[PDB]
Design a protein around this ligand. Structure first.
Ligand SMILES: Nc1nc2c([nH]c(=O)n2[C@H]2C[C@H](O)[C@@H](COP(=O)(O)O)O2)c(=O)[nH]1
Ligand SMILES: [Mg+2]
Length: 129
């Protein structure tokens, strides 16, 4: 009964663009362009898990809050929970502790190709805008 939760939040920049983590630099599998919000599982709740890890995945002080969407699926003998949170602003630069340097990119034109294909069902909704 192995289960693991993950909570993410696309940080909204000052130009209707959101900063995401593009596999940091490379480390193989560059098509895993993901966003901050990893490790909320630990022992928190869908509410404090992200809110708490947010500081750890943002570090800065951004007007960030609200959930855009949430995906709950369990792999063949695995339980992976992924919550997509919505962000409206962020002061300075996002650091927290995601571990994958990113840049301010327009979310309105996010690509399911650069990001992980295993998380398309979620993007399939926003991707179509
Ligand atoms: N957004 C997103 N999260 C994912 C994908 N695949 C995947 O294992 N995760 C999550 C679930 C796990 O709890 C966790 C494993 O790596 P971390 O320890 O770096 O968070 O990340 C994915 O394709 N998209
Ligand atoms: Mg974390």
């Amino acid at each position: 009964m192995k289960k693991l939760q993950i909570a993410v939040g696309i940080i909204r920049n000052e130009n209707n663009e959101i900063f995401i983590t593009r596999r940091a630099a490379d480390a193989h599998m560059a098509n895993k362009l993901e966003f901050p919000g990893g490790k909320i599982e630990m022992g928190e709740t869908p509410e404090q898990a992200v809110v708490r890890e947010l500081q750890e995945e943002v570090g800065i002080t951004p007007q960030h809050f609200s959930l855009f969407e949430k995906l709950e699926y369990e792999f063949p003998d695995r339980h992976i929970t992924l919550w997509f949170w919505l962000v409206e602003r962020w002061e300075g630069e996002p650091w927290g502790k995601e571990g994958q340097p990113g840049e301010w990119m327009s979310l309105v034109g996010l690509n399911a190709d650069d990001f992980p294909p295993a998380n398309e069902p979620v993007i399939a909704k926003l991707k179509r805008l």
